[PDB]
Design a protein around this ligand. Structure first.
Ligand SMILES: Cc1cc2nc3c(=O)[nH]c(=O)nc-3n(C[C@H](O)[C@H](O)[C@H](O)COP(=O)(O)OP(=O)(O)OC[C@H]3O[C@@H](n4cnc5c(N)ncnc54)[C@H](O)[C@@H]3O)c2cc1C
Length: 391
């Protein structure tokens, strides 16, 4: 018995959720995964802790999915970030909410998430065959044939959830784009998004340090969020978002305290004209950031003159950084681009050109910010694709 109602290709967050919803709707379901493990990429989101969704409202979500979020109104009315939170709560996983509405398991371990998903697939009788790479997908009359090098399976409904093109060592190497092409869909241009930034800058002084809520500016686009200093330059949300507007050759500007304007700072110093300038700023900033700003200046806040005060403050508020480029698609967190949404039903996620065929997750031309919006996007679209609609 190799024939199923539904076959789902790719066991990421989209694939797992379609397997759950399809089974739940009485569909006899097969999930195929190329790796020995499910959720290889998912296991590494949120610094490996697993950033499973975001707890904001609908507008927070739309602001979180800049790349074609508007297509998801229909999907989100069926299953949303709060349906996700319910599911994991219902099934005995303790979630928690961190900054910017990011949702993690209390365990801080991605296996708590993936293991819960596998457990449900099993309670619902879903079939999963791992360590199996699909190489071929055809359709005859009303019957999809799905083939690996060894075997073949059949179905009437086919869900393709093979992901994007970034981090191909997770398994997302584009096969779902080939399917889409084979059945004569348009695949848009595939390019990097949420790609960390290469800077020309003394990286050693600051790498590993994290900063909460800072403003990076460049031309019209100005962004206020979290930032990580890396050995190659800049990552974390702020860098990641800005990375869409920048290619290499630009100067961008960093505001390390968007809270205080020039004057508040000036006043703050006078209150601590007794401590060392490093120690002064050590109270407002992480220590290694303090070192960085105040190395070239006099030891003590009072030893400063007027011109030193004004120059220092302008560095604190407007440090110019030189960007020499960004990471490629391969090394970016998100693929901007995918299967074209003008040929997909926004409500069922069925292809408009081939009946029975469906697409969910990153394989579609949807792209979002890190912070749970991609994963939320994949679980939901997955849920919908796997679910049944009739009329
Ligand atoms: C380091 C990192 C951190 C991230 N952090 C975040 C974050 O904090 N928040 C956020 O929202 N997003 C984040 N993302 C993005 C997010 O992980 C993805 O957008 C999401 O996992 C996509 O889900 P998916 O199921 O569509 O594709 P994937 O999760 O990639 O899964 C696709 C699956 O298809 C399988 N497959 C592929 N080809 C075949 C084939 N031929 N045969 C069989 N199986 C196949 C693959 O093995 C894979 O398991 C991050 C990405 C990375 C790389």
């Amino acid at each position: 018995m190799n024939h199923f109602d539904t076959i789902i290709i790719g066991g990421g967050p989209a694939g797992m959720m379609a397997t759950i919803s399809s089974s739940f709707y009485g569909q006899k379901t097969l999930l195929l995964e190329k790796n020995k493990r499910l959720g290889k990429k998912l296991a590494g989101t949120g610094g490996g802790r697993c950033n499973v969704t975001n707890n904001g409202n609908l507008d927070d979500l739309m602001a979180g999915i800049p790349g074609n979020g508007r297509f998801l109104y229909s999907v989100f009315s069926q299953f949303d970030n709060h349906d996700i939170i319910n599911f994991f709560t219902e099934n005995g996983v303790k979630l928690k909410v961190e900054d910017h509405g990011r949702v993690f398991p209390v365990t801080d371990k991605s296996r708590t998430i993936i293991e819960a998903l596998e457990k449900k697939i099993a309670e619902l009788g879903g079939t999963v065959i791992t360590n199996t790479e699909i190489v071929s997908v055809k359709k005859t009359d009303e019957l999809f044939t799905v083939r690996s090098s060894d075997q073949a399976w059949t179905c009437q409904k086919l869900i393709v959830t093979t992901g994007g093109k970034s981090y191909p060592s997770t398994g997302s190497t584009g096969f779902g784009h080939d399917i889409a092409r084979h059945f004569k869909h348009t695949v848009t241009d595939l390019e990097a998004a949420e790609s960390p930034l290469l800077t020309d800058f003394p990286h050693k002084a600051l790498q590993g340090i994290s900063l909460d809520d800072v403003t990076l500016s460049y031309g019209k686009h100005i962004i206020t969020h979290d930032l990580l200093f890396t050995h190659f330059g800049l990552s974390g949300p702020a860098a990641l978002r800005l990375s869409s507007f920048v290619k290499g050759g630009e100067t961008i500007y960093l505001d390390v305290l968007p809270q205080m304007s020039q004057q508040d700072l000036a006043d703050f110093l006078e209150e601590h004209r007794e401590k060392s300038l490093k120690n002064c700023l050590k109270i407002l900033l992480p220590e290694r950031i303090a070192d960085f700003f105040t190395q070239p200046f006099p030891e003590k806040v009072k030893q400063l003159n007027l011109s030193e005060k004004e120059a220092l403050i302008k560095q604190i508020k407007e440090l110019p950084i030189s960007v020499t480029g960004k990471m490629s698609l391969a090394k970016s967190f998100v693929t901007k681009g995918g299967v074209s949404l003008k040929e997909i039903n926004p409500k069922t996620l069925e292809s408009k050109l081939v009946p029975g065929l469906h697409f969910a997750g990153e394989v579609l031309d949807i792209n979002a910010h890190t912070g749970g919006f991609n994963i939320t996007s994949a679980l939901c679209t997955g849920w919908v694709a796997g679910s049944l609609h009739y009329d």
